[PDB]
Structure 1
Amino acid sequence: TLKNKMRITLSLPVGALINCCDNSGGKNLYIIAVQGFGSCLNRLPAASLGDMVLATVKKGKPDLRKKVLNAIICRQSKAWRRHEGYYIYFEDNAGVIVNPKGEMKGSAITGPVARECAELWPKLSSAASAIV
């Protein structure tokens, strides 16, 4: 319960296909909207590490397919500056399917999860095997 997320370099605009990195059943997420995005004329809504997005799955279980559902980014391939003075980037973009309230509908995260997302979403940190 603290949303002072601190700015992270924006990646993953609308229309990005990312991995699901969870055991919910989906295999990829197709970002269609970013929560909290405002109004700039030609600006594509883009998402960062802790951002909650609206997405659909293109590969996965049929009950998950063909539906609009909330997701939370956990790994981003675009380098972002940690305030300790260095830059970090993963190998892939990945987010977990989540209830609009914020609780994950799966049970575990396959890969590492960024610490910025972890401290933003508590139960995600609990379900995360490795926090970087």
Structure 2
Amino acid sequence: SGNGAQGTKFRISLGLPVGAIMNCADNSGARNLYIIAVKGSGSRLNRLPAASLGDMVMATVKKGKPELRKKVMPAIVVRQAKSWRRRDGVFLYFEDNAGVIANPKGEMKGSAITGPVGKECADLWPRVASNSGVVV
């Protein structure tokens, strides 16, 4: 979360600790995203920081265009897999872990998002809304 995130976010189950790799779901040239940090996460001895739906992470691209590899950039988690629970009572989950590469302000690097996108992320990051097909 943080910059450019207009909205607050209700807690959702943390799915992705540091080291996790999600699918890159944009058209940027990136094939996956390797999580090295979660923004706005706190501190407890021994705890991995771990992201969830609509969290902004800091990632590198393990697989993808060489102009994207070997460096750290912001991304946003768009699909989960660890099931979480909404305030309408529902426990839900996607089939994959996936997020999209983005700028500190929260602008997509790419122009499409392939696959669905959870609403809690859509609601959080307007330029993600824009590029989303099926939401939730």
Tell me the TM-score normalized by structure 1.
0.97
CA RMSD of aligned residues (A): 0.8
For 1:12 and 1:117, the matched residues in 2 are separated by 15
Letter in 2 for 1:95: G
For 1:3 and 1:11, the matched residues in 2 are separated by 21
Say whether 1:10 aligns with 2:14: yes
Q: Which residue of 2 aligns with 1:75?
A: 79
Bigger fraction of residues in strand: 1
How do 1:3-82 residues align onto structure 2 when only pairs under 5 Å count? 3-82=7-86
Letter in 2 for 1:110: T
Q: How far does residue 76 in structure 1 lie from its aligned partner after superposition?
A: 0.2
Q: How far does residue 82 in structure 1 lie from its aligned partner after superposition?
A: 1.2
- Over 6 Å off, 4+ runs: none
- List gaps (5 residues or longer) in structure 2: none
For 1:85 and 1:2, the matched residues in 2 are separated by 24
Identity %: 70
For 1:9 and 1:86, the matched residues in 2 are separated by 12
CA deviation digits over 1:27-56, x for unaligned, max 9? Answer: 000000001112111110000101000000
- List gaps (5 residues or longer) in structure 1: none
Tell me the TM-score normalized by structure 2.
0.95
Q: Which residue of 2 aligns with 1:118?
A: 122
